[PDB]
């Protein structure tokens, strides 16, 4: 109901991200000062599955969805995992990632340039599949199909993490960058509709009151 034709929905957002500077501040819509707050909370939220316990999550390989120039790949994933794959729809950001990442960018194993609605991660490949601030660009059915494909790419004890914006009441339409913001209910329905289990749900604090609410979901 909030998407009249899907072809124009994707084509408008892809054009939007072509004209965005490959800087950290451009990845977050002009909020690059919160990158340190985000990464550190994502670091804590990720130890829940990395520390000792019954079902320890591996550290062999990870997949960053959205990624951009590698803001999360550089600060969060590359320190913790041996190899990291990146996937994005904007080729410019992946090219600029080779510079932004630096010496450690040599451990980035693959750069995929295509949309999540068309991306199929290899099975039995990743210990962590990080999906941050990008789900608002997919349709409700493509997001469920994508999460269904990610489940088959997880290694034993692997997890899927979704950290994106959540609306307070209703679906908020942002035609500035061609994205939809959803509430916790529709997201959890889509998550459950892919056959995934809720393992943890945490809300990011220490955030400006102008941006949306941000929640993290741990799935497998
Ligand atoms: C940092 C954050 C969370 N700000 C925010 O709250 O939104 C703001 C409202 N307005 C749009 C996005 C900024 C600036 C202008 C942000 C930046 S870019 C982004 C996003 C976009 C599209 C997506 F599909 C997605 O998953 C995520 N979120
Ligand atoms: N339909 C789509 N399929 C795959 N990636 C998309 C997409 N629409 C937007 N993106 C990517 O999602 C990012 C939007 S915000 C980038 C957030 C980034 N993942 C981070 O580390 O914080 C852009 O890099 C854009 O190229």
Short mmCIF file of N, CA and C in Angstrom, two decimals, residues 34-162:
data_model
loop_
_atom_site.label_atom_id
_atom_site.label_comp_id
_atom_site.label_asym_id
_atom_site.label_seq_id
_atom_site.Cartn_x
_atom_site.Cartn_y
_atom_site.Cartn_z
N UNK A 34 27.86 10.18 15.00
CA UNK A 34 27.32 9.09 15.81
C UNK A 34 27.97 7.75 15.48
N UNK A 35 28.89 7.72 14.51
CA UNK A 35 29.50 6.46 14.10
C UNK A 35 30.22 5.78 15.25
N UNK A 36 30.87 6.55 16.12
CA UNK A 36 31.56 5.96 17.26
C UNK A 36 30.57 5.37 18.26
N UNK A 37 29.43 6.03 18.46
CA UNK A 37 28.43 5.51 19.38
C UNK A 37 27.82 4.22 18.84
N UNK A 38 27.54 4.18 17.54
CA UNK A 38 26.98 2.99 16.92
C UNK A 38 27.91 1.79 17.06
N UNK A 39 29.17 1.95 16.62
CA UNK A 39 30.10 0.83 16.57
C UNK A 39 30.29 0.21 17.95
N UNK A 40 30.43 1.04 18.98
CA UNK A 40 30.71 0.51 20.31
C UNK A 40 29.54 -0.28 20.86
N UNK A 41 28.31 0.16 20.58
CA UNK A 41 27.15 -0.62 21.02
C UNK A 41 27.02 -1.90 20.21
N UNK A 42 27.27 -1.82 18.90
CA UNK A 42 27.32 -3.03 18.08
C UNK A 42 28.41 -3.98 18.56
N UNK A 43 29.52 -3.44 19.09
CA UNK A 43 30.56 -4.30 19.63
C UNK A 43 30.07 -5.05 20.86
N UNK A 44 29.34 -4.36 21.74
CA UNK A 44 28.81 -5.01 22.94
C UNK A 44 27.72 -6.01 22.59
N UNK A 45 26.78 -5.59 21.75
CA UNK A 45 25.69 -6.47 21.32
C UNK A 45 26.19 -7.72 20.61
N UNK A 46 27.39 -7.68 20.02
CA UNK A 46 27.91 -8.82 19.29
C UNK A 46 28.63 -9.82 20.19
N UNK A 47 29.15 -9.37 21.34
CA UNK A 47 29.81 -10.28 22.27
C UNK A 47 28.86 -11.31 22.84
N UNK A 48 27.56 -11.03 22.84
CA UNK A 48 26.58 -11.98 23.34
C UNK A 48 26.74 -13.34 22.68
N UNK A 49 27.17 -13.36 21.42
CA UNK A 49 27.33 -14.58 20.64
C UNK A 49 28.79 -14.95 20.41
N UNK A 50 29.72 -14.03 20.63
CA UNK A 50 31.14 -14.31 20.44
C UNK A 50 31.82 -14.87 21.69
N UNK A 51 31.31 -14.55 22.88
CA UNK A 51 31.95 -15.04 24.09
C UNK A 51 31.65 -16.53 24.27
N UNK A 52 32.36 -17.15 25.22
CA UNK A 52 32.18 -18.56 25.51
C UNK A 52 30.73 -18.88 25.86
N UNK A 53 30.37 -20.15 25.68
CA UNK A 53 29.01 -20.58 25.91
C UNK A 53 28.64 -21.83 25.14
N UNK A 54 27.35 -22.17 25.13
CA UNK A 54 26.89 -23.37 24.43
C UNK A 54 27.04 -23.31 22.91
N UNK A 55 26.57 -22.23 22.29
CA UNK A 55 26.58 -22.09 20.84
C UNK A 55 27.42 -20.88 20.48
N UNK A 56 28.74 -21.06 20.48
CA UNK A 56 29.65 -19.97 20.20
C UNK A 56 29.67 -19.66 18.71
N UNK A 57 29.52 -18.38 18.37
CA UNK A 57 29.59 -17.96 16.98
C UNK A 57 31.03 -17.81 16.53
N UNK A 58 31.33 -18.32 15.34
CA UNK A 58 32.69 -18.29 14.84
C UNK A 58 33.15 -16.90 14.46
N UNK A 59 34.45 -16.80 14.16
CA UNK A 59 35.06 -15.54 13.74
C UNK A 59 35.81 -15.69 12.42
N UNK A 60 35.43 -16.67 11.60
CA UNK A 60 36.16 -16.94 10.37
C UNK A 60 35.82 -15.95 9.26
N UNK A 61 34.53 -15.66 9.06
CA UNK A 61 34.12 -14.81 7.96
C UNK A 61 32.81 -14.11 8.30
N UNK A 62 32.65 -12.91 7.74
CA UNK A 62 31.46 -12.10 7.96
C UNK A 62 31.07 -11.41 6.66
N UNK A 63 29.82 -10.97 6.60
CA UNK A 63 29.26 -10.33 5.42
C UNK A 63 28.59 -9.03 5.85
N UNK A 64 29.01 -7.92 5.26
CA UNK A 64 28.44 -6.61 5.54
C UNK A 64 27.47 -6.27 4.42
N UNK A 65 26.21 -6.04 4.77
CA UNK A 65 25.17 -5.72 3.80
C UNK A 65 24.88 -4.23 3.85
N UNK A 66 24.91 -3.59 2.68
CA UNK A 66 24.92 -2.15 2.61
C UNK A 66 26.35 -1.67 2.56
N UNK A 67 27.04 -1.76 3.70
CA UNK A 67 28.47 -1.52 3.79
C UNK A 67 28.86 -0.11 3.35
N UNK A 68 28.57 0.23 2.10
CA UNK A 68 29.01 1.52 1.59
C UNK A 68 30.52 1.50 1.41
N UNK A 69 31.18 2.51 1.99
CA UNK A 69 32.64 2.57 1.96
C UNK A 69 33.28 1.69 3.03
N UNK A 70 32.49 0.95 3.80
CA UNK A 70 33.04 0.06 4.80
C UNK A 70 33.16 0.64 6.19
N UNK A 71 32.25 1.54 6.57
CA UNK A 71 32.26 2.12 7.91
C UNK A 71 32.20 1.04 8.99
N UNK A 72 31.25 0.10 8.87
CA UNK A 72 31.16 -0.97 9.85
C UNK A 72 32.18 -2.07 9.57
N UNK A 73 32.54 -2.28 8.30
CA UNK A 73 33.56 -3.28 7.99
C UNK A 73 34.91 -2.89 8.59
N UNK A 74 35.23 -1.59 8.61
CA UNK A 74 36.52 -1.13 9.12
C UNK A 74 36.59 -1.16 10.64
N UNK A 75 35.58 -0.62 11.32
CA UNK A 75 35.66 -0.44 12.76
C UNK A 75 35.19 -1.65 13.56
N UNK A 76 34.21 -2.40 13.07
CA UNK A 76 33.59 -3.47 13.84
C UNK A 76 34.00 -4.86 13.38
N UNK A 77 33.91 -5.14 12.08
CA UNK A 77 34.03 -6.50 11.58
C UNK A 77 35.48 -6.92 11.34
N UNK A 78 36.25 -6.13 10.59
CA UNK A 78 37.63 -6.51 10.28
C UNK A 78 38.49 -6.75 11.52
N UNK A 79 38.37 -6.00 12.62
CA UNK A 79 39.15 -6.37 13.82
C UNK A 79 38.80 -7.74 14.38
N UNK A 80 37.56 -8.20 14.20
CA UNK A 80 37.08 -9.40 14.87
C UNK A 80 37.13 -10.66 14.01
N UNK A 81 37.08 -10.54 12.69
CA UNK A 81 37.03 -11.69 11.80
C UNK A 81 38.23 -11.71 10.87
N UNK A 82 38.59 -12.91 10.40
CA UNK A 82 39.70 -13.04 9.46
C UNK A 82 39.37 -12.42 8.11
N UNK A 83 38.28 -12.87 7.49
CA UNK A 83 37.88 -12.36 6.19
C UNK A 83 36.51 -11.72 6.31
N UNK A 84 36.27 -10.72 5.46
CA UNK A 84 34.99 -10.02 5.43
C UNK A 84 34.60 -9.80 3.98
N UNK A 85 33.35 -10.09 3.65
CA UNK A 85 32.79 -9.77 2.35
C UNK A 85 31.88 -8.57 2.47
N UNK A 86 31.81 -7.78 1.40
CA UNK A 86 30.99 -6.59 1.35
C UNK A 86 30.05 -6.68 0.16
N UNK A 87 28.85 -6.14 0.32
CA UNK A 87 27.86 -6.13 -0.75
C UNK A 87 27.13 -4.79 -0.71
N UNK A 88 26.96 -4.19 -1.88
CA UNK A 88 26.31 -2.89 -2.02
C UNK A 88 25.85 -2.75 -3.46
N UNK A 89 24.94 -1.80 -3.67
CA UNK A 89 24.38 -1.57 -5.00
C UNK A 89 25.12 -0.46 -5.73
N UNK A 90 25.91 0.35 -5.02
CA UNK A 90 26.59 1.51 -5.59
C UNK A 90 28.08 1.20 -5.77
N UNK A 91 28.51 1.05 -7.02
CA UNK A 91 29.89 0.66 -7.30
C UNK A 91 30.89 1.68 -6.75
N UNK A 92 30.53 2.97 -6.79
CA UNK A 92 31.46 4.01 -6.35
C UNK A 92 31.89 3.79 -4.90
N UNK A 93 30.96 3.40 -4.03
CA UNK A 93 31.30 3.21 -2.62
C UNK A 93 32.25 2.04 -2.43
N UNK A 94 32.06 0.96 -3.21
CA UNK A 94 32.95 -0.18 -3.11
C UNK A 94 34.35 0.16 -3.61
N UNK A 95 34.44 0.96 -4.67
CA UNK A 95 35.74 1.41 -5.16
C UNK A 95 36.44 2.27 -4.11
N UNK A 96 35.71 3.24 -3.54
CA UNK A 96 36.28 4.09 -2.51
C UNK A 96 36.59 3.33 -1.23
N UNK A 97 35.98 2.16 -1.03
CA UNK A 97 36.28 1.37 0.16
C UNK A 97 37.72 0.89 0.18
N UNK A 98 38.29 0.61 -1.00
CA UNK A 98 39.68 0.18 -1.06
C UNK A 98 40.63 1.23 -0.49
N UNK A 99 40.23 2.50 -0.50
CA UNK A 99 41.02 3.59 0.07
C UNK A 99 40.65 3.85 1.53
N UNK A 100 39.35 3.90 1.83
CA UNK A 100 38.91 4.17 3.19
C UNK A 100 39.38 3.09 4.16
N UNK A 101 39.34 1.82 3.74
CA UNK A 101 39.71 0.73 4.63
C UNK A 101 41.21 0.73 4.91
N UNK A 102 42.02 0.96 3.88
CA UNK A 102 43.45 1.08 4.07
C UNK A 102 44.19 -0.25 4.03
N UNK A 103 45.20 -0.38 4.89
CA UNK A 103 46.02 -1.59 4.89
C UNK A 103 45.19 -2.82 5.24
N UNK A 104 44.23 -2.67 6.16
CA UNK A 104 43.40 -3.80 6.58
C UNK A 104 42.38 -4.19 5.52
N UNK A 105 42.06 -3.29 4.59
CA UNK A 105 41.15 -3.62 3.50
C UNK A 105 41.60 -4.78 2.63
N UNK A 106 42.87 -5.18 2.74
CA UNK A 106 43.36 -6.33 1.99
C UNK A 106 42.75 -7.64 2.48
N UNK A 107 42.24 -7.68 3.71
CA UNK A 107 41.55 -8.86 4.21
C UNK A 107 40.09 -8.91 3.78
N UNK A 108 39.55 -7.82 3.22
CA UNK A 108 38.23 -7.87 2.60
C UNK A 108 38.31 -8.82 1.42
N UNK A 109 37.58 -9.93 1.50
CA UNK A 109 37.75 -11.01 0.54
C UNK A 109 37.04 -10.72 -0.77
N UNK A 110 35.79 -10.27 -0.71
CA UNK A 110 35.01 -10.04 -1.92
C UNK A 110 34.26 -8.72 -1.82
N UNK A 111 34.09 -8.07 -2.97
CA UNK A 111 33.22 -6.92 -3.12
C UNK A 111 32.12 -7.29 -4.11
N UNK A 112 30.88 -7.32 -3.64
CA UNK A 112 29.73 -7.61 -4.49
C UNK A 112 29.01 -6.31 -4.80
N UNK A 113 28.70 -6.10 -6.08
CA UNK A 113 28.02 -4.89 -6.53
C UNK A 113 26.69 -5.30 -7.15
N UNK A 114 25.66 -5.39 -6.31
CA UNK A 114 24.30 -5.64 -6.77
C UNK A 114 23.38 -5.43 -5.57
N UNK A 115 22.09 -5.32 -5.86
CA UNK A 115 21.11 -5.10 -4.81
C UNK A 115 20.83 -6.36 -4.01
N UNK A 116 20.41 -6.15 -2.75
CA UNK A 116 20.08 -7.29 -1.89
C UNK A 116 18.92 -8.10 -2.46
N UNK A 117 17.98 -7.44 -3.15
CA UNK A 117 16.87 -8.16 -3.77
C UNK A 117 17.34 -9.15 -4.83
N UNK A 118 18.58 -9.01 -5.31
CA UNK A 118 19.16 -9.93 -6.27
C UNK A 118 20.37 -10.69 -5.74
N UNK A 119 20.85 -10.38 -4.54
CA UNK A 119 22.08 -10.97 -4.02
C UNK A 119 21.79 -12.29 -3.33
N UNK A 120 22.63 -13.29 -3.61
CA UNK A 120 22.49 -14.62 -3.03
C UNK A 120 23.81 -15.04 -2.41
N UNK A 121 23.98 -14.88 -1.09
CA UNK A 121 25.24 -15.29 -0.45
C UNK A 121 25.44 -16.80 -0.56
N UNK A 122 26.70 -17.20 -0.72
CA UNK A 122 27.02 -18.61 -0.87
C UNK A 122 26.64 -19.38 0.39
N UNK A 123 26.15 -20.61 0.27
CA UNK A 123 25.76 -21.36 1.47
C UNK A 123 26.96 -21.75 2.32
N UNK A 124 26.72 -21.86 3.63
CA UNK A 124 27.72 -22.32 4.59
C UNK A 124 28.99 -21.46 4.53
N UNK A 125 28.80 -20.15 4.55
CA UNK A 125 29.90 -19.24 4.26
C UNK A 125 30.22 -18.27 5.39
N UNK A 126 29.22 -17.70 6.05
CA UNK A 126 29.43 -16.61 7.00
C UNK A 126 29.04 -17.01 8.41
N UNK A 127 29.81 -16.52 9.38
CA UNK A 127 29.48 -16.66 10.79
C UNK A 127 28.58 -15.53 11.28
N UNK A 128 28.68 -14.35 10.67
CA UNK A 128 27.85 -13.20 11.00
C UNK A 128 27.49 -12.50 9.70
N UNK A 129 26.21 -12.18 9.53
CA UNK A 129 25.72 -11.44 8.37
C UNK A 129 25.14 -10.14 8.90
N UNK A 130 25.89 -9.05 8.77
CA UNK A 130 25.50 -7.76 9.31
C UNK A 130 24.71 -6.96 8.28
N UNK A 131 23.50 -6.54 8.67
CA UNK A 131 22.60 -5.78 7.82
C UNK A 131 22.19 -4.55 8.61
N UNK A 132 22.82 -3.41 8.32
CA UNK A 132 22.58 -2.19 9.07
C UNK A 132 22.19 -1.06 8.14
N UNK A 133 21.05 -0.44 8.42
CA UNK A 133 20.59 0.78 7.75
C UNK A 133 20.55 0.59 6.23
N UNK A 134 19.61 -0.25 5.80
CA UNK A 134 19.46 -0.57 4.38
C UNK A 134 18.13 -1.27 4.13
N UNK A 135 17.52 -1.83 5.18
CA UNK A 135 16.29 -2.60 4.98
C UNK A 135 15.13 -1.71 4.54
N UNK A 136 15.21 -0.40 4.78
CA UNK A 136 14.16 0.49 4.32
C UNK A 136 14.11 0.67 2.81
N UNK A 137 15.09 0.14 2.08
CA UNK A 137 15.12 0.22 0.63
C UNK A 137 14.57 -1.02 -0.05
N UNK A 138 14.24 -2.06 0.72
CA UNK A 138 13.68 -3.29 0.18
C UNK A 138 12.18 -3.34 0.45
N UNK A 139 11.46 -4.03 -0.44
CA UNK A 139 10.05 -4.30 -0.21
C UNK A 139 9.89 -5.37 0.87
N UNK A 140 8.68 -5.43 1.44
CA UNK A 140 8.40 -6.41 2.49
C UNK A 140 8.63 -7.83 2.01
N UNK A 141 8.36 -8.12 0.74
CA UNK A 141 8.55 -9.49 0.25
C UNK A 141 10.01 -9.76 -0.09
N UNK A 142 10.70 -8.77 -0.67
CA UNK A 142 12.12 -8.96 -0.98
C UNK A 142 12.94 -9.08 0.30
N UNK A 143 12.59 -8.33 1.34
CA UNK A 143 13.30 -8.43 2.61
C UNK A 143 13.13 -9.81 3.22
N UNK A 144 11.93 -10.39 3.11
CA UNK A 144 11.71 -11.73 3.63
C UNK A 144 12.44 -12.78 2.80
N UNK A 145 12.39 -12.64 1.47
CA UNK A 145 13.13 -13.56 0.61
C UNK A 145 14.63 -13.46 0.84
N UNK A 146 15.13 -12.24 1.04
CA UNK A 146 16.55 -12.05 1.30
C UNK A 146 16.96 -12.71 2.61
N UNK A 147 16.22 -12.45 3.69
CA UNK A 147 16.52 -13.09 4.97
C UNK A 147 16.42 -14.60 4.88
N UNK A 148 15.52 -15.11 4.04
CA UNK A 148 15.44 -16.55 3.82
C UNK A 148 16.72 -17.07 3.18
N UNK A 149 17.28 -16.32 2.23
CA UNK A 149 18.53 -16.74 1.59
C UNK A 149 19.71 -16.64 2.56
N UNK A 150 19.71 -15.62 3.42
CA UNK A 150 20.81 -15.48 4.38
C UNK A 150 20.85 -16.64 5.36
N UNK A 151 19.69 -17.21 5.70
CA UNK A 151 19.67 -18.33 6.62
C UNK A 151 20.46 -19.52 6.09
N UNK A 152 20.39 -19.75 4.78
CA UNK A 152 21.13 -20.86 4.19
C UNK A 152 22.60 -20.61 3.99
N UNK A 153 23.05 -19.37 4.13
CA UNK A 153 24.46 -19.03 4.01
C UNK A 153 25.19 -19.03 5.34
N UNK A 154 24.46 -19.20 6.45
CA UNK A 154 25.08 -19.19 7.76
C UNK A 154 25.83 -20.49 8.02
N UNK A 155 26.97 -20.37 8.69
CA UNK A 155 27.69 -21.52 9.19
C UNK A 155 27.05 -21.98 10.50
N UNK A 156 27.40 -23.18 10.98
CA UNK A 156 26.89 -23.62 12.28
C UNK A 156 27.14 -22.58 13.37
N UNK A 157 26.11 -22.31 14.16
CA UNK A 157 26.06 -21.30 15.21
C UNK A 157 26.10 -19.88 14.66
N UNK A 158 26.07 -19.69 13.34
CA UNK A 158 26.09 -18.36 12.78
C UNK A 158 24.81 -17.59 13.07
N UNK A 159 24.92 -16.26 13.04
CA UNK A 159 23.80 -15.38 13.34
C UNK A 159 23.61 -14.37 12.22
N UNK A 160 22.42 -13.78 12.19
CA UNK A 160 22.08 -12.66 11.32
C UNK A 160 21.70 -11.48 12.20
N UNK A 161 22.27 -10.31 11.93
CA UNK A 161 22.03 -9.12 12.73
C UNK A 161 21.40 -8.05 11.86
N UNK A 162 20.29 -7.48 12.33
CA UNK A 162 19.59 -6.39 11.66
C UNK A 162 19.57 -5.20 12.61
#
